[PDB]
Design an enzyme around this catalytic site. Structure first.
Site, PDB file in Angstrom:
ATOM      1  N   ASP A  55      86.169 -44.132 -71.966  1.00 18.10           N
ATOM      2  CA  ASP A  55      85.735 -42.823 -72.080  1.00 18.10           C
ATOM      3  C   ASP A  55      85.989 -42.031 -71.366  1.00 18.10           C
ATOM      4  OD1 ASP A  55      83.976 -40.656 -73.179  1.00 18.10           O
ATOM      5  OD2 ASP A  55      81.980 -42.124 -72.390  1.00 18.10           O
ATOM      6  N   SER A  94      93.664 -25.217 -75.492  1.00 16.16           N
ATOM      7  CA  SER A  94      94.612 -24.908 -76.049  1.00 16.16           C
ATOM      8  C   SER A  94      94.662 -23.676 -76.523  1.00 16.16           C
ATOM      9  CB  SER A  94      93.982 -25.999 -77.668  1.00 16.16           C
ATOM     10  OG  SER A  94      94.778 -25.901 -78.511  1.00 16.16           O
TER      11      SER A  94
END
Length: 330
Positions: A35, A199
């Site tokens: 994770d 992004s």
């Protein structure tokens, strides 16, 4: 040193991935959910409330000659999906794919919430976010990657998750045969303890690319892709009959649909998520309403590039003094 381990979807939907991890002496192999959105290595154990164990493999520290109680240390964690676990702490030897760390904090669960009990395939979590998020008190502990870093040939790990197929976590090296083209690296903020990046935009299907900054986290422990409501609405508007359902908890779509791809930007590069990766199947057995793999982050407080996004790429988690993320097509 290096390590290399195969990671395997737990079910036919890629709801999560499990990677075998050796703990203790002699080794006890547990299948852990790696994770990158958390920083605790915790396991089902001989200490876990018996009624909360249902098929998981347990770590038994009393059977490990290298286990030592970390006296006074406790841990307690809550995840973004509302699940939680807590317990005490041992140090022990932990190996992943041939890479060994001695003295790793292994957090032994005394209690786990129902979603963990109900998932017999996941024996615990191995956190790979920054150690500043580790929950051990009163002495915060380091992640497996943080402990291994100095010994690694290069201070990196990579995630190469499969679509409906196994993939690979590598530690200490970048497998140049595992991706196509070049790797595009992008800046990371560690201010929230995550692999947080920006992004450069998105496209839906064959549509034009929208240049817009989307801050979010690379999180292998989250199944879906969670993005701002504007972006998610633009995606689902291209699917006839798709709608957001408050009763189901997100966007659903007719199972008869063919889904468009979704592209996200990494600097000037582009990662394309095929439409099939966005199909999470019937909302309930036999239903013709299917659950979408792109969902709004509006209720979370952070955008999450979960498995849906990451499995479309070869992803480098660069833990150099200034961390960065790398993405390549594959």
């Amino acid at each position: 040193s290096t390590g290399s381990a195969t990671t395997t979807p737990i079910d036919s939907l890629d709801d999560a991935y499990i990677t075998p991890v050796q703990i203790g002496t002699p080794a006890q192999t547990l299948n852990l959910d790696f994770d990158t959105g958390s920083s605790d290595l915790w396991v089902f154990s001989s200490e876990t409330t018996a009624s909360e164990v249902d098929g998981q493999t347990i770590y038994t520290p009393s059977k490990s000659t290298t286990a030592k109680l970390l006296s006074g240390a406790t841990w307690s964690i809550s995840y973004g999906d509302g699940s939680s676990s807590s317990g005490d702490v041992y140090t022990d030897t932990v190996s992943v794919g041939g890479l060994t760390v001695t003295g790793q904090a292994v957090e032994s669960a005394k209690k786990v919430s129902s979603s963990f009990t109900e998932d017999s395939t996941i024996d615990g979590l191995l956190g790979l976010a920054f150690s500043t998020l580790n929950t051990v008190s009163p002495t915060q502990q380091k992640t497996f990657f943080d402990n291994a870093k100095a010994s690694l040939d290069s201070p990196v790990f990579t995630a190469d998750l499969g679509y409906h197929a196994p993939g690979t976590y590598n530690f200490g090296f970048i497998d140049t045969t595992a991706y196509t083209g070049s790797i595009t690296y992008t800046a990371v903020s560690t201010k929230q303890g995550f692999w947080e990046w920006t992004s450069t935009g998105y496209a839906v299907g064959s549509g034009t690319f929208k240049s817009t900054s989307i801050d979010g986290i690379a999180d292998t422990g989250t199944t879906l892709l969670y993005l701002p409501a504007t972006v998610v609405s633009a995606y689902w508007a291209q699917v006839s009959g798709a709608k957001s359902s408050s009763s189901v908890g997100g966007y659903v779509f007719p199972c008869s649909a063919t889904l468009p791809s979704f592209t996200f930007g990494v600097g000037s590069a582009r990662i394309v998520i095929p439409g099939d990766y966005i199909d999470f199947g019937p909302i309930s057995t036999g239903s013709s309403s299917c659950f979408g793999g792109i969902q709004s982050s509006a209720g979370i407080g952070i955008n999450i590039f979960g498995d849906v996004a990451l499995k479309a790429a070869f992803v480098v988690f660069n833990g150099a003094t200034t961390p960065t993320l790398g993405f390549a097509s594959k």
